[PDB]
Design a protein around this ligand. Structure first.
Ligand code: SF4
Ligand code: SF4
Ligand code: SF4
Ligand code: SF4
Ligand code: FES
Ligand code: K
Ligand code: ZN
Lengths: 699, 209, 96, 115, 129, 48, 106, 87
C-alpha cells in the first residue's frame, strides 16, 4: 500500500514510510552496531556508531535517526562503513579506563563485544586518560563514571520512562559529566532499570557487586510475585544460589523493565527462612521436629474437627496449585471457609463473574485508550509497571488522566477531581464537568484499585464505579468490544484464588470463628489470636517467619517462588508459570506436596501425586489457569451491574487515602521484602538521605 | 599474498577440485545430491545413503580418481535434522595427491551399508560409530562395541547423552567386586555460556525466517 | 589479625569459623586449621597516603609490566582519598 | 513417507520370531554362566532376570526397534559366552548394592524434592 | 526410485528403549522448549535466533568437605539446539520426554522519529539532549 | 643467594617448612565462605 | 609489595581452566575492595598447563617452582585460599625472581 | 450433610456449541442468583472448551454434565436437576 522499497546490501525490503535505515536492516536480519540507540527511548544520534554508507552517497548517515528513502541501497559491510565503526570505537576507548577485570560489566558489555566484532585489535593512543569523580545516586546503583561513554540513555530513561528529570549533563566537551550536579538520589520505583540500559559498567548494581560473572550464571525464566502485574523475569543462579533478578521482555506486560522491589528483593529470600518443621513443646516453645511428627499432629486435629471448625487463610505469595490443594482437603471435611487476606466485595455477582474482578482492558489496552479515570489507587506503587504504561500513552498518544483520591505524584500531570467518594455519584448523574469527557471519549477506561475496596464501604465504590462504566459503555459512543471497567490488584495470589472459589477476606472467619486455622502464607495479620476460639490449633505453611509463624502451633516449611514451578494469575487474568531455579532450602518442601502428604496421613487422600495431575485439577475448577500467557476475555458485565444495584449500600464520608503515599511505603509490603536488607537500606535512604547510607565505591 | 596474517588463496586447486565434482555428479547422478568446494579448497560430495558402495567403489577404482586410502570414517550428530546422523568418509588419492570428503545421512533406526567390501579399514571405524552413535552398519563382519565398557548401555557421542553419563563405578567390600551406581558428583560440571550476542561473521548470515 | 573464637578456632580473613555445634570441626582434631596470619586488609591500611600535585594520578602498582593495568584516579573530591581499584593504594591532592 | 528401509524383520511376526530364538539362547546360557563365572546366584534367579529384561520392553510394536534390541542382546551374548565380560559386569543386572529406593509419595516426600 | 525394497511402519517413532537412558530420567523429566530471552544487559540479538531444549532443575547441595555444589542430576547441563519448534518437539517425542513449548517473543516494530523530540504542541518534546 | 640475595618483603616466611604430610601440622581442606541462608530463630516466649 | 592480595576476583582463571579445577566466590570487602572469599584449586583436576597464570591480568596466580608436594591423602591436595596464600608467602622469593627472568618473553 | 455447595459453568466465548450456555447467562442467570443468594455459581469462560456444568456436593463429591450443543432451556433444566436433586 504505502510501503516503500529499499535495498539492504542489494536485497529488497518493503518498509513503512518513516522507517529508519536501522529498522530496515533488522528486517533482513542485520543488527547495526549501537551504543546510544534504544528502541524504547528517544533517538539521540550521539554515539555515531550506527554510521552506515548509502551507495552513491558521499557521507555516512546515522542509521538510528535517518529515515529510509525510496531506492536507497544500504551498505552495511562496505569498507567505508567498516572504517567508520573502527574510528568511532577508537575514540570511545581512548579515555576508557582499564577496568574490565574489576568491572562487573565484563562478559556482558557491549563496548567489549562491539570492539571485538567492529573494532581494531590495538591502540594508537599514546596520551593520558580522563578521570572523573564518582557520584552517589543511592544505595541501589553504583557509579563508576569514568567508564561512562556519554550515551545519555540514563538521562532519557529517567525523563521519558520514569518521569524524573534529575539526570543530566554538566559541562561541555571531554569534561562533560553525566550526573545530578547536586548530591541527589535517583530513587524511584523504576530506578534500577538504568543499570540495564547503561551499556557499560558506569552504572551497576550495588547488591550484586563482585558476586559473580555473566558466563558462570544459569538463566531461569520465571515470574515476579512482588506485585500482580506478573512481570516476566530471569533468575540468574550459580551453584544453587540466586545471584540477581533480570527483566525478561514481554511486550504486553513489563516491556523490558522491572520494579526495584522485583529487582532487589531477592536477597530477603536468604534471611528469616523456615527450614525445618516446628511444633510446640510442653513449655510452649516451638522446637524442631520431623515431617512425620508434625504432619501427624496436624492430621489428628483435622480428623477431629469438621465443618466450620476448620478454616484457612491465603496470603499474597501463594500458588494456584497449593490453593486448590488446600481447598480440596478442607472440602473433604465439608469446610468451605476458604479465605484470603484481600477484601473484594461479595455483594451482587461477587466472584461469580471474572469480569467483576479483572483488569479487563489489559495492560496493553491503555495504549489505545483516550481517557483514564483512577479511583482510590496509587498505580506508581501498587503497580509500578502499570503506571509506566499509562505515562507512555500520556506521552505518545496524548492520554488524559483523572484521579479520585489523595493527590499523589504519578510522574505525569493529571486532573485531580477530588478525594471524597461522593464525586463518583456526580460523575454518573452528569453534574461533574468530567462526565462529558467520559461521554465524548471513544475508548474511556475506568480503573479501581483493590486498595480502595478494603474499606468497609468497598461494595458501594465498586457499584458506583461500575455504574459509571455501564452508562458510557451502553451509550453508542463506546466501541463493540472495548471494556471500560477494570480492577487493579496489588496481590499476586488474589485473582487465582478468586477464580478458584476462595471467599475474599476474613469476614467469614469472624462470623464463625474456627477451632483450627491453616495460615497458608498469611503474614498480613488479618486474623490474630485475639479473634479466635482460645485453644485454636494454627498451622502456618510458608517460607518466612514474619507474623504468622510465631503464633502458630505447627510450622510446615514451604518453598518460595524461586524454588517451585507454580501458576500465578495477574490482574489481567493471564496465567503464567514460574520455573524452579534453586530448590527449597533445608527440609522445606513444595506447598502442594505438603497438603497432599497431609491428606494421605489423614485418610482423605487427594487424587493427584504429580504436578501435571494437580494442574489438570486446576483446569476442572477453572480452565483458564492452565492456558499460559493467554488473556481470556470476560463478558456479561451488564448481568453483574443488575445484581449490584439490588442491595444499595451507602458510601462513607472518609476520603480515599491510598495505603502507600510515598516511596518509603513502597519498599516493604510483603514477607520477602521485609526480610531483605537492601529494601531496608532504601527505606533508610528516602527517610534520611545518603548522609549515612553512603558507602565506599572503588571498583 | 603479501598480507602477513591472512591465509593465502590457491585458485588453481579450487578450479581443479570443482571440475572433478562436476565429473562425479555427471557420472553418478543416481546418488549425488550436492557437490561443494570450500574456501580453503576441500571438495565434499553429498550422496544418498544408498550409493555408499557404488560411489566409494567408483572413487577407489576409477582411473581418474584412485582414492585407495580411507583416511577416516566418522559421524556427526545434528539433532535438529530429522536424519540426525551425518556419515562422513574422508579419502586420500596418492596417485593424484588429492583428498575428497563424501557425506551421507541416516537416522537412529535406518541402517547404512558397510563399506568393508571397498576398504578393509572401515571395519573398526564402523564399529566405533555404532558404539558411540548407535548407527547400524548392515552386513558387517563383526559389529560390536569397541570403545565403551562391557555392558555399557547408551551411545555417548550423541548430543543428548550427558557428559558424565548415568552410572559410575566403585569397589564395594561387601560384595568384594567393582559395582556400578548412579552418578553423583561432588562438584557439578559448570556450564559456561560463552556465545556473544553480537554477530561475528556476516557472510554466513542465515536468511530471516 | 587472627582472632580466636570462644571455641578456640582461628577465624580467617573471610570471617569463616565453625560454630559450636558444627560437626565439621572434627576434621581439625589431631590436625590443624591452616590460616594465613597476614591479613591483606590490615596491611594495605598501613601504607601511607601519597600527596600529589594534580587532579589526576596514574597507578600501575609498581614494577611496570609486573604490576596491574594502568588506571587514572580522580582526586578532585577533598572528602576522601583516591584509591586504586587494583592495589588499594591511596592518593591525595596536595593543596597548591 | 512411512516407507522405511528395514533392518532384518519386515513385520512384527518375523521379528517376534527372533525375540523367541534369542530367549532360547539366553535360557541355555545361564547354567553355563553361573558355573563359569562362579556366581553365587541360582540358575532360576538368572533365568528370572532374563525374563525381566525381556518383559521391560513388552510394549514395543515397531519391527525396526525390536530388531535393534535383538541385535544388542545378541552382542551381550557373545560377550558373556566368550567371557569378554567379567563377574562385575554379569552381576550389574541384579543391582545388589543399590538399597531399595522409595516408590510412594510419602516416602519420596520425607526424603527429598524429587517427583 | 529407491529400490531397497521398503516396509511400512504406521506406529509413532519411540526410541526410548534403545537409548540406554534410565527410566527415572525419562518419565519424570519435563523438557522446556524455548527461544532464549535476550540478556537485558546487552543489546545484541544473536543468541535469540535458535530454539533450545532444557530440562527441569533439580537439587544441588553443598559438599561437606569444600562447600562445592554437588548434584545427582545427569541432565543438569544438557542443552540442545534446534532450528525450529517442530524439530525440537519431534526430538522430545521420539525420546519419550514430556515437554512444554513457549512461543517466541519477537520485539514489536516501533515508530522512531528524531523530529518528535522537538514537537511544537506535543508532549514528546525532550527537555535535554 | 650469597651473591645475589632475594628481595625482602615483610610477608615472606622467615622459617621454611618441609613437607608436613602425615603429621599433626598437615593441611586439612575446608570451605572459606560463610553461611548462605540464615534460619528463623523461634521466639523465646510461650505465646498464648 | 604492600602485602595486599593481587587477586581482584576477575575469574578469568576460572573461565580458562581447561579442567574446571578453580572455584571462586567473591564479595565486597569491608573496605570496598573486590576480593575473594573462596579461591579453591583441585590439584587432582589440574593439568598444570599454566593458562591461569597467562590469563591473570595482575600476576596473582602462578605455577611455582616446587614439585615436591606429594601427600599421603587426597584431601591434602584440595587447595583453598589460605593454602595458596601460604605457598605464595613461602615461595615468594623464588617466584618473583623467576618472573623477573621471563616476564620479557611473556 | 449432603447438599449442594457450588456450581461451576464452563464455556467458550465464541464457539457455536456453547451458544445455549451463553443464553442462560445473559437472561436467566440473574434470576437464579437472586433465588439462590449464598450458593456460589461460578461462570468461567475460556476459548475452545467443551461446555460443562460442575456441581460440588458436601465432602468433596463432584458431578459433571456436558452441555455441548444444548439449548438454553435444556441448560435451565439441567441446573434445576442439580439444585433440586442433591447427593
Ligand atoms: S564498561 Fe567495564 S567491561 Fe566494558 S569495556 Fe569498560 S571496563 Fe571493560
Ligand atoms: S552513565 Fe551509562 S547510560 Fe548514562 S550516559 Fe553514561 S554510558 Fe550512557
Ligand atoms: S594450570 Fe591447572 S589450575 Fe591453572 S588453568 Fe591449567 S589446569 Fe587450570
Ligand atoms: S587469580 Fe588472577 S585471573 Fe584469577 S580471579 Fe584472581 S585476578 Fe582474576
Ligand atoms: S546508535 Fe546512532 S549515533 Fe548512537
Ligand atoms: K550497566
Ligand atoms: Zn594501583
Amino acid at each position: 500500500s504505502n510501503l516503500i522499497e529499499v535495498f539492504v546490501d542489494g536485497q529488497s525490503v518493503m518498509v513503512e514510510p518513516g522507517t529508519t535505515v536501522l529498522q530496515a536492516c533488522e528486517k533482513v536480519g542485520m543488527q547495526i552496531p549501537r551504543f546510544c540507540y534504544h528502541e524504547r527511548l528517544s533517538v539521540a544520534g550521539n554515539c555515531r556508531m550506527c554510521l552506515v554508507e548509502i551507495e552513491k552517497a558521499p557521507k555516512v548517515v546515522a542509521a538510528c535517526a535517518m529515515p529510509v528513502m525510496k531506492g536507497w541501497n544500504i551498505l552495511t559491510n562496505s569498507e567505508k562503513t567498516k572504517k567508520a565503526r573502527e574510528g568511532v570505537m577508537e575514540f570511545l576507548l581512548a579515555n576508557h579506563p582499564l577496568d574490565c577485570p574489576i568491572c562487573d560489566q565484563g562478559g556482558e558489555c557491549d563496548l567489549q563485544d562491539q570492539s571485538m566484532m567492529f573494532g581494531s585489535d590495538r591502540s594508537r593512543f599514546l596520551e593520558g586518560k580522563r578521570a572523573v569523580e564518582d557520584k552517589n545516586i543511592g544505595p541501589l546503583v553504583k557509579t563508576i563514571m569514568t567508564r561512562c561513554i556519554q550515551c545519555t540513555r540514563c538521562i532519557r530513561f529517567a525523563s521519558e520512562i520514569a518521569g524524573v528529570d534529575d539526570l543530566g549533563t554538566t559541562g561541555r566537551g571531554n569534561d562533560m559529566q553525566v550526573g545530578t550536579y547536586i548530591e541527589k538520589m535517583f530513587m524511584s520505583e523504576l530506578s534500577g532499570n538504568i543499570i540495564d540500559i547503561c551499556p557499560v559498567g558506569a552504572l551497576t548494581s550495588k547488591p550484586y557487586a563482585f558476586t559473580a560473572r555473566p558466563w558462570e550464571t544459569r538463566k531461569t525464566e520465571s515470574i515476579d510475585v512482588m506485585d500482580a502485574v506478573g512481570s516476566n523475569i530471569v533468575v540468574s543462579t550459580r551453584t544453587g544460589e540466586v545471584m540477581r533478578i533480570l527483566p525478561r521482555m514481554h511486550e504486553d506486560i513489563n516491556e523490558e523493565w522491572i520494579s526495584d522491589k522485583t529487582r532487589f528483593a531477592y536477597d530477603g529470600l536468604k534471611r528469616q527462612r523456615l527450614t525445618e518443621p516446628m511444633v510446640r513443646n510442653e513449655k510452649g516453645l516451638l522446637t524442631h521436629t520431623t515431617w512425620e511428627d508434625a504432619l501427624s499432629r496436624v492430621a489428628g486435629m483435622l480428623q477431629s474437627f469438621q465443618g466450620n471448625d476448620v478454616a484457612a487463610i491465603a496470603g499474597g505469595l501463594v500458588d494456584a496449585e497449593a490453593l486448590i490443594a488446600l481447598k480440596d482437603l478442607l472440602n473433604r471435611v465439608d469446610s468451605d471457609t476458604l479465605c484470603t487476606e484481600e477484601v473484594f466485595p461479595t455483594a451482587g455477582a461477587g466472584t461469580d463473574l471474572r469480569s467483576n474482578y479483572l483488569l479487563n482492558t489489559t495492560i496493553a489496552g491503555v495504549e489505545e485508550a483516550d481517557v483514564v479515570l483512577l479511583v482510590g489507587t496509587n498505580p506508581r506503587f501498587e503497580a509500578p509497571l502499570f503506571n509506566a504504561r499509562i505515562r507512555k500513552s500520556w506521552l505518545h498518544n496524548d492520554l488524559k488522566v483523572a484521579l479520585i483520591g489523595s493527590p499523589v505524584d504519578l510522574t505525569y500531570r493529571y486532573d485531580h477531581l477530588g478525594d471524597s467518594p461522593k464525586i463518583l455519584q456526580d460523575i454518573a448523574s452528569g453534574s461533574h464537568p468530567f462526565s462529558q469527557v467520559l461521554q465524548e471519549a471513544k475508548k474511556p477506561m475506568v480503573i479501581l484499585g483493590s486498595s480502595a475496596l478494603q474499606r468497609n464501604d468497598g461494595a458501594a465504590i465498586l457499584a458506583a464505579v461500575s455504574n459509571i462504566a455501564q452508562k458510557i459503555r451502553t451509550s453508542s459512543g463506546v466501541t463493540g468490544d472495548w471494556k471500560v471497567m477494570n480492577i487493579l490488584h496489588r496481590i499476586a495470589s488474589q485473582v487465582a484464588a478468586l477464580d478458584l472459589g476462595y471467599k475474599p477476606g476474613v469476614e467469614a472467619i469472624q462470623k464463625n470463628p474456627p477451632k483450627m486455622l491453616f495460615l497458608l502464607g498469611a503474614d498480613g495479620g488479618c486474623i490474630t489470636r485475639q479473634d479466635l476460639p482460645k485453644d485454636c490449633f494454627i498451622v502456618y505453611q510458608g517460607h518466612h517467619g514474619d507474623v504468622g509463624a510465631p503464633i502458630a502451633d505447627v510450622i510446615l516449611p514451604g518453598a518460595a517462588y524461586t524454588e517451585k514451578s507454580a501458576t500465578y494469575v495477574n490482574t489481567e487474568g493471564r496465567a503464567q508459570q514460574t520455573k524452579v531455579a534453586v530448590t527449597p532450602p533445608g527440609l522445606a518442601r513444595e506447598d502442594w506436596k505438603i497438603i497432599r502428604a497431609l491428606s494421605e496421613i489423614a485418610g482423605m487422600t487427594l487424587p493427584y501425586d504429580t504436578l501435571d495431575q494437580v494442574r489438570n485439577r486446576l483446569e476442572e475448577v477453572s480452565p483458564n489457569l492452565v492456558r499460559y500467557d493467554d488473556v481470556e476475555g470476560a463478558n456479561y458485565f451488564q448481568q453483574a451491574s443488575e445484581l449490584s444495584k439490588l442491595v444499595n449500600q451507602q458510601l462513607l464520608a472518609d476520603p480515599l487515602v491510598p495505603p502507600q503515599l510515598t516511596i518509603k511505603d513502597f519498599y516493604m509490603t510483603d514477607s520477602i521484602s521485609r526480610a531483605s536488607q537492601t529494601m531496608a537500606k532504601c527505606v533508610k535512604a528516602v527517610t534520611e538521605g545518603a548522609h549515612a547510607v553512603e558507602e565506599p565505591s572503588i571498583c | 599474498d603479501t598480507r602477513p596474517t591472512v591465509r593465502p588463496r590457491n585458485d588453481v586447486a579450487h578450479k581443479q577440485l570443482s571440475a572433478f565434482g562436476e565429473y562425479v555428479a555427471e557420472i553418478l547422478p543416481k546418488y549425488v545430491q550436492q557437490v561443494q568446494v570450500s574456501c580453503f579448497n576441500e571438495l565434499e560430495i553429498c550422496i544418498h545413503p544408498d550409493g555408499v558402495i557404488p560411489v566409494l567403489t567408483f572413487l577407489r577404482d576409477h582411473s581418474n580418481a584412485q582414492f585407495k586410502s580411507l583416511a577416516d570414517l566418522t559421524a556427526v550428530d545434528i539433532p535438529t535434522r530429522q536424519n540426525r546422523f551425518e556419515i562422513v568418509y574422508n579419502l586420500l588419492s596418492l596417485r593424484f595427491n588429492s583428498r575428497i570428503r563424501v557425506k551421507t545421512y541416516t537416522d537412529e533406526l535406518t541402517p547404512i551399508e558397510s563399506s568393508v567390501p571397498v576398504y578393509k579399514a572401515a571395519n573398526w571405524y564402523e564399529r566405533e560409530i555404532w558404539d558411540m552413535f548407535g548407527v547400524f552398519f548392515a552386513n558387517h563382519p563383526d559389529l560390536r562395541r569397541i570403545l565403551t565398557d562391557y555392558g555399557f548401555e547408551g551411545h555417548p557421542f550423541r548430543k543428548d547423552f550427558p557428559l558424565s553419563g548415568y552410572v559410575e563405578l566403585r569397589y564395594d567390600d561387601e560384595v568384594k567386586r567393582v559395582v556400578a551406581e548412579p552418578v553423583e558428583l561432588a562438584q557439578e560440571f559448570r556450564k559456561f555460556d560463552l556465545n556473544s550476542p553480537w554477530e561475528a561473521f556476516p557472510a554466513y548470515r542465515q536468511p530471516p525466517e | 589479625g587472627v582472632r580466636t573464637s570462644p571455641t578456640g578456632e582461628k577465624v580467617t580473613h573471610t570471617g569463616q569459623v565453625y560454630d559450636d555445634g558444627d560437626y565439621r570441626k572434627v576434621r581439625f582434631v589431631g590436625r590443624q586449621k591452616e590460616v594465613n596470619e597476614n591479613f591483606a586488609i590490615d596491611l594495605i591500611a598501613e601504607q601511607p597516603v601519597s600527596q600529589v600535585g594534580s587532579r589526576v594520578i596514574s597507578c600501575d602498582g609498581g614494577g611496570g609490566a609486573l604490576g596491574h593495568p594502568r588506571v587514572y584516579i580522580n582526586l578532585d573530591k577533598e572528602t576522601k582519598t583516591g584509591t586504586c581499584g587494583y592495589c588499594g593504594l591511596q592518593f591525595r591532592q596536595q593543596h597548591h | 513417507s512411512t516407507s522405511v528401509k528395514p533392518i532384518f524383520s519386515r513385520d512384527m511376526n518375523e521379528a517376534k520370531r527372533r525375540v523367541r530364538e534369542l530367549y532360547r539362547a539366553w535360557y541355555r546360557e545361564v547354567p553355563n554362566t553361573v558355573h563359569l563365572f562362579q556366581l553365587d546366584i541360582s540358575v532360576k534367579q538368572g533365568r528370572d532376570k532374563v525374563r525381566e529384561m525381556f518383559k521391560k520392553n513388552a510394549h514395543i510394536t515397531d519391527p525396526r526397534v525390536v530388531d535393534l534390541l535383538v541385535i544388542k542382546g545378541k552382542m551381550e551374548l557373545e560377550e558373556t559366552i566368550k567371557v569378554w565380560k567379567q563377574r562385575t559386569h554379569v552381576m550389574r543386572f541384579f543391582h545388589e548394592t543399590e538399597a531399595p529406593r522409595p516408590k510412594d509419595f510419602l516416602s519420596k516426600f520425607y526424603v527429598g524434592h524429587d517427583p | 526410485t529407491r529400490d531397497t525394497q521398503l516396509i511400512t511402519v504406521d506406529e509413532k517413532l519411540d526410541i526410548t528403549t534403545i537409548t540406554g537412558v534410565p527410566e527415572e530420567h525419562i518419565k519424570t523429566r519435563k523438557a522446556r522448549i524455548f527461544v532464549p530471552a535476550r540478556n537485558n544487559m546487552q543489546s545484541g540479538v544473536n543468541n535469540t535466533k535458535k530454539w533450545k531444549m532444557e530440562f527441569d532443575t533439580r537439587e544441588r547441595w553443598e559438599n561437606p568437605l569444600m562447600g562445592w555444589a554437588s548434584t545427582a542430576d545427569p541432565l543438569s547441563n544438557l542443552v540442545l539446539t534446534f532450528s525450529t519448534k517442530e524439530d525440537a518437539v519431534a526430538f522430545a517425542e521420539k525420546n519419550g520426554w514430556s515437554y512444554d513449548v513457549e512461543e517466541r517473543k519477537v520485539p514489536k516494530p516501533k515508530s522512531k522519529s528524531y523530529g518528535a523530540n522537538f514537537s511544537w504542541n506535543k508532549r514528546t518534546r525532550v527537555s535535554t539532549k | 643467594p650469597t651473591v645475589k640475595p632475594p628481595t625482602a618483603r615483610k610477608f615472606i616466611w622467615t622459617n621454611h617448612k618441609f613437607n608436613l604430610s602425615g603429621t599433626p601440622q598437615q593441611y586439612v581442606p575446608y570451605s572459606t565462605t560463610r553461611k548462605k541462608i540464615q534460619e528463623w530463630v523461634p521466639p523465646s516466649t510461650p505465646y498464648k | 609489595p604492600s602485602g595486599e592480595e593481587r587477586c581482584i576476583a576477575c575469574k578469568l582463571c576460572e573461565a580458562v581452566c581447561p579442567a574446571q579445577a578453580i572455584t571462586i566466590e567473591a564479595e565486597p570487602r569491608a573496605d570496598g575492595s573486590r576480593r575473594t572469599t573462596r579461591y579453591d584449586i583441585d590439584m587432582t583436576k589440574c593439568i598444570y598447563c599454566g593458562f591461569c597464570q597467562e590469563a591473570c591480568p595482575v600476576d596473582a596466580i602462578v605455577e611455582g617452582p616446587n614439585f615436591e608436594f606429594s601427600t599421603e591423602t587426597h584431601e591434602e591436595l584440595l587447595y583453598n585460599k589460605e593454602k595458596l596464600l601460604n605457598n605464595g608467602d613461602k615461595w615468594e622469593a623464588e617466584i618473583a625472581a623467576n618472573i623477573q627472568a621471563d616476564y620479557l618473553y611473556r | 450433610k449432603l447438599g449442594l455447595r457450588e456450581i461451576r459453568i464452563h464455556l467458550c466465548q465464541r464457539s457455536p456449541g456453547s451458544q445455549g450456555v451463553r443464553d442462560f447467562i445473559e437472561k436467566r442467570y440473574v434470576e437464579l442468583k437472586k433465588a439462590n443468594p449464598d450458593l456460589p455459581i461460578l461462570i468461567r469462560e475460556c476459548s475452545d472448551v467443551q461446555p460443562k456444568l460442575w456441581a460440588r456436593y458436601a465432602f468433596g463429591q463432584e458431578k459433571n454434565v456436558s452441555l455441548n450443543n444444548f439449548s438454553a432451556d435444556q441448560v435451565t433444566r439441567a441446573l434445576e436437576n442439580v439444585l433440586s436433586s442433591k447427593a
